Short mmCIF file of C-alpha atoms and ligand atoms in Angstrom, two decimals:
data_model
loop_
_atom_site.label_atom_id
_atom_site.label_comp_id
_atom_site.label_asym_id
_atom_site.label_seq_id
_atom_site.Cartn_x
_atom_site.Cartn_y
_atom_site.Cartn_z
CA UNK A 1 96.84 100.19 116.75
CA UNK A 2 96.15 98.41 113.39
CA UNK A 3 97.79 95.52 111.23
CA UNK A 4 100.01 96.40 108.41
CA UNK A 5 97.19 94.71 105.86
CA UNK A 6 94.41 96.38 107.53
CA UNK A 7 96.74 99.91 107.02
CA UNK A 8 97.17 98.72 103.57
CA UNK A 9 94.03 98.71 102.65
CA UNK A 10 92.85 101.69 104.45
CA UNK A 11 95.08 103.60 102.09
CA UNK A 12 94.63 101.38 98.76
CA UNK A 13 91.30 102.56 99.73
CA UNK A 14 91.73 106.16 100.22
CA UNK A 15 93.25 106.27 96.96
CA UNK A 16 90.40 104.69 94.85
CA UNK A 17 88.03 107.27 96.16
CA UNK A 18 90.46 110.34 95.66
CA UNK A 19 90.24 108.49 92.09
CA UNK A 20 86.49 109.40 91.85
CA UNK A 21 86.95 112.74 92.28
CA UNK A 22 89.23 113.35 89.32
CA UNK A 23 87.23 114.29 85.93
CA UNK A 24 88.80 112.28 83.49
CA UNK A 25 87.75 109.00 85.70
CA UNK A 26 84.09 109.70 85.21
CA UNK A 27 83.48 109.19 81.31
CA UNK A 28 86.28 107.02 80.77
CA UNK A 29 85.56 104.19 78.41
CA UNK A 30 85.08 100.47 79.65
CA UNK A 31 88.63 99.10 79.73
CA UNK A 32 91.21 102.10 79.54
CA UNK A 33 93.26 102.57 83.06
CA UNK A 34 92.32 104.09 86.27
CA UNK A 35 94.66 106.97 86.64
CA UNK A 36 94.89 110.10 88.75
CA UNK A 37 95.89 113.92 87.66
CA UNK A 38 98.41 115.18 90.74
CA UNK A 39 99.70 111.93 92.81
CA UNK A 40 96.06 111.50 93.81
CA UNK A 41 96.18 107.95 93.43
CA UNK A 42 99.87 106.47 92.62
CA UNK A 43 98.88 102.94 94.22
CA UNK A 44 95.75 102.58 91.98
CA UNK A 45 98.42 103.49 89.14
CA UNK A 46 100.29 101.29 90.27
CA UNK A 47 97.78 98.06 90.21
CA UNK A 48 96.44 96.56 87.19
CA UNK A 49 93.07 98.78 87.21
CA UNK A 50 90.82 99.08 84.29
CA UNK A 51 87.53 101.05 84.43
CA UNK A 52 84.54 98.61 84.03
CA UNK A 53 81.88 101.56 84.30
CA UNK A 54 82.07 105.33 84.55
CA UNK A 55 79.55 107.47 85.39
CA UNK A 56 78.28 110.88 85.87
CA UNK A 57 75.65 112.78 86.94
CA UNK A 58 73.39 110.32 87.31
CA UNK A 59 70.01 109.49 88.76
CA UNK A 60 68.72 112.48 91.32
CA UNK A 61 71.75 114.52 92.78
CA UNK A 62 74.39 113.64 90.72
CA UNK A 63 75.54 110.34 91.24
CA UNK A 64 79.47 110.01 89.94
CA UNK A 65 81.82 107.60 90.19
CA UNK A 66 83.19 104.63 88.68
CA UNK A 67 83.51 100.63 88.62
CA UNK A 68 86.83 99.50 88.37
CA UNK A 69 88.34 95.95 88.19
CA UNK A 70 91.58 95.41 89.95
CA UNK A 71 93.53 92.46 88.33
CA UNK A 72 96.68 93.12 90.78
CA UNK A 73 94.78 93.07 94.06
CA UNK A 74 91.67 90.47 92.57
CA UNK A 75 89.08 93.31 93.29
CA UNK A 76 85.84 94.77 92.15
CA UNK A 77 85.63 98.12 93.36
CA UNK A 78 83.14 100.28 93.39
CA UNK A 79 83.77 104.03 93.87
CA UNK A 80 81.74 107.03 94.59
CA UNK A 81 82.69 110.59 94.08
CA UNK A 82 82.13 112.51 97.01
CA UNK A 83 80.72 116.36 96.88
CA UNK A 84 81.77 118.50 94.13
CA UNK A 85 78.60 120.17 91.94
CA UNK A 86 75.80 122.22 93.24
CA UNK A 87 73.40 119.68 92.98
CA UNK A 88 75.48 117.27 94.96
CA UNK A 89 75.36 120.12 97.56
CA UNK A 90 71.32 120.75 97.64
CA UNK A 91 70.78 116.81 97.50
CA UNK A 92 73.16 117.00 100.85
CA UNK A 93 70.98 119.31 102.51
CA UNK A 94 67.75 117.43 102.45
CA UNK A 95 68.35 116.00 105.32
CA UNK A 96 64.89 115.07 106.82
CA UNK A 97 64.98 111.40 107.63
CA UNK A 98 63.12 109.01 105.25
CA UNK A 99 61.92 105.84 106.12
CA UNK A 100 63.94 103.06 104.55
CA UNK A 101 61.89 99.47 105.49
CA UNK A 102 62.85 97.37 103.14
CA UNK A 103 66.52 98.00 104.01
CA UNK A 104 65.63 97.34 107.80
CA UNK A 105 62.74 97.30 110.06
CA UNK A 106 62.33 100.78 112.37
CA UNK A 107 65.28 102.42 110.05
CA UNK A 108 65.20 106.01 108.61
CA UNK A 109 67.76 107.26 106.45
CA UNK A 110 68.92 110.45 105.19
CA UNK A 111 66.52 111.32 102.60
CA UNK A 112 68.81 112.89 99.75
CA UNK A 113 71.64 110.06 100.17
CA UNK A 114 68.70 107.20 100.34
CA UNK A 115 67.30 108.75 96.75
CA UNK A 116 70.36 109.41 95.11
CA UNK A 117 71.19 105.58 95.90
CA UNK A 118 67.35 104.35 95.13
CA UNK A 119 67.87 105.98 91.91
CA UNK A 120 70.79 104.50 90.59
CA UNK A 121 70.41 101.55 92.44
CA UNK A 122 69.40 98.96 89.75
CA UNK A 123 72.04 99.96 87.20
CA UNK A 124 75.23 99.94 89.38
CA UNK A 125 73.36 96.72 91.02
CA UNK A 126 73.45 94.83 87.66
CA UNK A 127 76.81 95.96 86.86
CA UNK A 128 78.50 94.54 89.85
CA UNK A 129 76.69 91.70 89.48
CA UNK A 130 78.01 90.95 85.87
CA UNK A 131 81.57 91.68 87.23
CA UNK A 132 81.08 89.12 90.16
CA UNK A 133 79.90 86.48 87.79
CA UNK A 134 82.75 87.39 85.32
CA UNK A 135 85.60 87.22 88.69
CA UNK A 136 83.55 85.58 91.75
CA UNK A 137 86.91 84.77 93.22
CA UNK A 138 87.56 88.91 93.04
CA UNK A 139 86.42 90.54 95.89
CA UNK A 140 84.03 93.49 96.07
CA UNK A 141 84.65 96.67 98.22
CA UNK A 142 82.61 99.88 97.70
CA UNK A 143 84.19 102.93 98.99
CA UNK A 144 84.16 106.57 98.83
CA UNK A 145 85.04 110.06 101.01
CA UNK A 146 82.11 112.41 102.28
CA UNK A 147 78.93 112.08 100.04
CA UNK A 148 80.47 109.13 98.30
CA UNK A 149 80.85 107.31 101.36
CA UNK A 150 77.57 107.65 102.23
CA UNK A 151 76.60 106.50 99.03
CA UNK A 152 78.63 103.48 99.49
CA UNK A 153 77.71 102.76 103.13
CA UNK A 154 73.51 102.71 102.17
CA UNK A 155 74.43 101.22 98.82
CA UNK A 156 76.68 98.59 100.54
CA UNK A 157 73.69 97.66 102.98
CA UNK A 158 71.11 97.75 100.05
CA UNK A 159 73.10 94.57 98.46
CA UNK A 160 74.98 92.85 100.96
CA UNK A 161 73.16 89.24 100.49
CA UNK A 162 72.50 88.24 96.98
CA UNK A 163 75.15 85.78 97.41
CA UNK A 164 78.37 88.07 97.61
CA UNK A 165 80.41 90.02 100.33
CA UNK A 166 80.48 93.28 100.45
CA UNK A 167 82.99 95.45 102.17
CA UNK A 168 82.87 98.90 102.71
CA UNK A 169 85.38 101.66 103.15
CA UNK A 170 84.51 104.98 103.84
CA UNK A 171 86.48 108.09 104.37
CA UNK A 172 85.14 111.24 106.13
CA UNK A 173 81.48 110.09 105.88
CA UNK A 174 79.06 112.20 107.52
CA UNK A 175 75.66 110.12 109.61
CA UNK A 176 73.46 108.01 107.27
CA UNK A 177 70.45 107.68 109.27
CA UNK A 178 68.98 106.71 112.91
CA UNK A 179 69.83 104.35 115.63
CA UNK A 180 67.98 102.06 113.67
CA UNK A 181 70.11 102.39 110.85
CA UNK A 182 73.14 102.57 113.38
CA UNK A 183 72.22 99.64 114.80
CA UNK A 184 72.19 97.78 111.73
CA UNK A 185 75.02 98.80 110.08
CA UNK A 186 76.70 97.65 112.83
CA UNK A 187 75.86 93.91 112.90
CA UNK A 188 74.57 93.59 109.48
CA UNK A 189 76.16 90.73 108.00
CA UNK A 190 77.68 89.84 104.39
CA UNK A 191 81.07 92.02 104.19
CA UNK A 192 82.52 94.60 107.00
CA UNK A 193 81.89 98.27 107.20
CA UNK A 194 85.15 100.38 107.91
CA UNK A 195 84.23 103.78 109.21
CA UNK A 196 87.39 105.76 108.60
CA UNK A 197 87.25 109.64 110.18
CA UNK A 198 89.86 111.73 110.79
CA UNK A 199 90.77 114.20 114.01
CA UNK A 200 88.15 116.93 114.13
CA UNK A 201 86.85 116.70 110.67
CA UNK A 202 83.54 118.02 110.40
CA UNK A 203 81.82 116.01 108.15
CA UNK A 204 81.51 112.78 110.67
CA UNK A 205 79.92 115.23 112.92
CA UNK A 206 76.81 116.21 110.75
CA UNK A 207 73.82 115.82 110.48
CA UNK A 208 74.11 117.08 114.21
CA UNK A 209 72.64 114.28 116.57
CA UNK A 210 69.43 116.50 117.58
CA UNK A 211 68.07 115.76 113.96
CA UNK A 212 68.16 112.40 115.39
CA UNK A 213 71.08 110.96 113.75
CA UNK A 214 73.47 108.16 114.66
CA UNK A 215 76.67 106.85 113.78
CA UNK A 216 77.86 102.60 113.32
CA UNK A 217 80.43 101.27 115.25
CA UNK A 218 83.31 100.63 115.60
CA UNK A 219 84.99 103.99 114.11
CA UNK A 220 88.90 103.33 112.78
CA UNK A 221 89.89 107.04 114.28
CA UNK A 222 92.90 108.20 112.50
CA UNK A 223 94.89 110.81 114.80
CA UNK A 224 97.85 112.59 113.05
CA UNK A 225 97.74 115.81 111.65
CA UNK A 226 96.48 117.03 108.00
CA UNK A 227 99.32 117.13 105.59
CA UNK A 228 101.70 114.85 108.07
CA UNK A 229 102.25 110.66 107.01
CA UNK A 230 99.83 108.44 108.43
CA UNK A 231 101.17 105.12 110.09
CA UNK A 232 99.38 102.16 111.80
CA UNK A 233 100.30 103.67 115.22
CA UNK A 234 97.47 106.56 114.35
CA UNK A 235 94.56 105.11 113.72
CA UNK A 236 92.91 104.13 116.70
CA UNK A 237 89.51 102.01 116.71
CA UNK A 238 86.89 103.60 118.88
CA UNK A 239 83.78 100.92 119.57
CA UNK A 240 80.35 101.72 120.37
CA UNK A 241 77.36 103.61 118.44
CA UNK A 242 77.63 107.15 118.82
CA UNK A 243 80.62 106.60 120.87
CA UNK A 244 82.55 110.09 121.66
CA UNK A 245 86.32 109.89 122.33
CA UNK A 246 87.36 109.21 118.29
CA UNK A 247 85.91 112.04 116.22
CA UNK A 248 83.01 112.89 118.02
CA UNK A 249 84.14 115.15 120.68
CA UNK A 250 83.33 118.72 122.33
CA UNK A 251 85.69 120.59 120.32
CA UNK A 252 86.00 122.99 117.57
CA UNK A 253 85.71 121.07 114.09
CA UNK A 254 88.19 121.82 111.10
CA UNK A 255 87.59 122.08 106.79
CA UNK A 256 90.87 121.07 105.82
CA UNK A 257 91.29 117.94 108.28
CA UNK A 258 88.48 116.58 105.90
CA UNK A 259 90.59 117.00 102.98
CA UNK A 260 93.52 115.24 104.68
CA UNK A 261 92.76 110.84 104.62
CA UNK A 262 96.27 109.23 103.54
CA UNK A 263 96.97 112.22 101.36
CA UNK A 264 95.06 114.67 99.98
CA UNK A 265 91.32 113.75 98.80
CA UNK A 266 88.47 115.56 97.27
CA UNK A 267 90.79 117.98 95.41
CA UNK A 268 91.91 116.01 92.00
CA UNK A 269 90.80 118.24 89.30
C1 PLC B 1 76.66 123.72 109.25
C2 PLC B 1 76.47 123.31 107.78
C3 PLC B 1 75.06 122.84 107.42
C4 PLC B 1 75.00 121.36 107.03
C5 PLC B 1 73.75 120.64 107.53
C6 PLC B 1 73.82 119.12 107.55
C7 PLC B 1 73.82 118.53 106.14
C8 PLC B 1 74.78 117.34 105.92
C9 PLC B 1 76.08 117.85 105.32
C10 PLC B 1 76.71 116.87 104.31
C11 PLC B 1 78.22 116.87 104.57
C12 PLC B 1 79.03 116.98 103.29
O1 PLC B 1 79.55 116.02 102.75
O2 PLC B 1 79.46 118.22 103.10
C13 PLC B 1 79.32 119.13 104.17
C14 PLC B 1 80.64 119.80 104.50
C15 PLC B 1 80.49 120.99 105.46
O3 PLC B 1 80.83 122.19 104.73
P1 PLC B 1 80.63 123.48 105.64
O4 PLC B 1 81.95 123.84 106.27
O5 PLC B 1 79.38 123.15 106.63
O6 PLC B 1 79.88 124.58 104.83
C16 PLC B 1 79.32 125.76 105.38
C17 PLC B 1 79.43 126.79 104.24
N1 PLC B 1 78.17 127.48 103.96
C18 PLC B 1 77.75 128.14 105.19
C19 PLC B 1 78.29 128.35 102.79
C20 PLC B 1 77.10 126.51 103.72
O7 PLC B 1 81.49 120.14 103.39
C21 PLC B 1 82.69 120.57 103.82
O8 PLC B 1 82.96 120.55 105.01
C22 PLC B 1 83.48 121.43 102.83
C23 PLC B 1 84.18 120.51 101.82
C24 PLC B 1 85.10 121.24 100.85
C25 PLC B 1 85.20 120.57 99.47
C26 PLC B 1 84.63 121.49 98.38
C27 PLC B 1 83.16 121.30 97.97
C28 PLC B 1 82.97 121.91 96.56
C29 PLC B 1 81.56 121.69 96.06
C30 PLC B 1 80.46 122.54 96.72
C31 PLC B 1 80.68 124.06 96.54
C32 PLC B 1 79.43 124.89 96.81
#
């Protein structure tokens, strides 16, 4: 149900935020190689990928991740780590929607994910921005799994039009905000957002939709098992905010099918 590219990159992807997860890639020095303990991220290996910026715990709720330039594929990515320390976990539980305006007009967003980015939000700004000018034929993608894909998604949205696409790949991403925010998401303009969740995990399911929480369309649903192969016959796009049928359905969620997107994510030590 998907083209061999857009496969491609779902998993080049998939890789670069398993990447973020893995110590060693978060107080690297500018130039060494993006590299992954495990087979985390063989692809990444693989590519001419040099860190441009690492960073931990920063701003409010531990912001980690890393800014990597990819010679091989002409790419300026920008990763986030998803949820490893504690305060990662407290900053994932306010979840009380603030009101984000000057991102959109009537849009709330989470209020933890929304600060975390606010408060990192100039530095990581300026640093894409030098990379850009440096390769403005390179193209930029921000990506992450679970926290960091929120992270990316607001972040994403927060920059897209200064002159520069921005695409967005997220993996096992829980809501970001209201219908709203949905909304916008949705047909905001400037790059593409790809919404990547996978059978039952519970993450895309939370904050519950009675806190008043939506989700973007289209969702990229990927539908074989944790720890089998994925191939472009298994992800499945599902269209339409809040749209039930891909992940969101009636049905018992599962941990581990969170830690399963392409190979295994969110465990690299
Ligand atoms: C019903 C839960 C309340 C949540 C309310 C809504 C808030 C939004 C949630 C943000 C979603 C998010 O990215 O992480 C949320 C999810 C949900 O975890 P869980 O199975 O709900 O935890 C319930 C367990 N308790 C009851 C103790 C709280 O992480 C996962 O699935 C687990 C991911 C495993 C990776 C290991 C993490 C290691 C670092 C942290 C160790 C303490």
């Amino acid at each position: 149900e998907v083209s061999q590219d857009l496969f491609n990159q779902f998993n080049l992807f998939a890789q670069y935020s398993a990447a973020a997860y893995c110590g060693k890639n978060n107080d690297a020095p500018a130039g060494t190689n993006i590299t992954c303990t495990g087979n985390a991220c063989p692809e990444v290996e693989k590519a001419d990928a040099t860190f441009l910026y690492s960073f931990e715990d920063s701003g409010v709720g531990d912001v980690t991740g890393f800014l990597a330039l990819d010679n091989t594929n002409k790419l300026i990515v920008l990763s986030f780590r998803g949820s490893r320390s504690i305060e990662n976990w407290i900053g994932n539980l306010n979840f009380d929607l603030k009101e984000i305006n000057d991102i959109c007009s009537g849009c709330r967003g989470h209020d933890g994910f929304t600060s975390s980015w606010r408060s990192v939000a100039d530095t990581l700004r300026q640093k894409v921005e030098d990379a850009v000018r440096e390769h403005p034929d390179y193209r930029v993608v921000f990506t992450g799994h679970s926290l960091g894909g929120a992270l990316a998604t607001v972040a994403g949205a927060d920059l897209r039009g200064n002159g520069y696409d921005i695409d967005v790949f997220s993996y096992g991403a829980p809501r970001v905000g209201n219908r709203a925010f949905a909304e916008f998401l949705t047909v905001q303009t400037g790059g593409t957002l790809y919404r990547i969740t996978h059978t039952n995990d519970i993450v895309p399911r939370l904050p519950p939709r009675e806190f008043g929480y939506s989700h973007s369309s289209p969702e990229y649903w990927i539908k074989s098992g944790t720890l089998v192969p994925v191939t472009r016959n298994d992800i499945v796009k599902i269209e339409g905010i809040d749209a039930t049928g891909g992940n969101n359905q009636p049905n018992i969620p599962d941990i581990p099918a969170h830690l399963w997107y392409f190979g295994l994510i969110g465990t690299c030590l």
